[PDB]
Amino acid sequence: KLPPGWEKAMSRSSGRVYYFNHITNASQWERPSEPARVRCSHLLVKHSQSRRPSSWRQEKITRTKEEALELINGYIQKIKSGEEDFESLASQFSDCSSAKARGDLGAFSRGQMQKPFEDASFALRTGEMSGPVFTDSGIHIILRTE
């Protein structure tokens, strides 16, 4: 049947079936198997098209949205490989002062965050991580902690 937002796909490189979630942009080999509030951390990479292209990391953010997506993709690879963990990359690289809390946003309900961020967060299971999620703020990786 599959939980909210999951579809079956075929790997372009290997032909093996995998699963993709169009709400969270998550993808995984394994077959996948609502609350008032969720708790999430995030790692935001901002770009020249961000509504406010500035962070505690740098006053003027100049990277292209394409460059921002490559950075996000690289961080996701490191997190999934276990070379680095989410908290460590969030502390170092998130373009939001929540970096100082290892990316933790705290708990929130529907109606509080931008819709793509909200929809991804509510469709993650506890412990699950999103793929790249685009909002007006920039591109996010979202980790649902509660």
């Binding site: 939001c96 929540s98 929130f108 509080q112 965050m113 931008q114 961020f117």
Partner: peptide, 6 residues
């Protein structure tokens, strides 16, 4: 806790 998202 800093204006644009919590």
């Amino acid at each position: 806790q800093a204006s644009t998202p919590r």
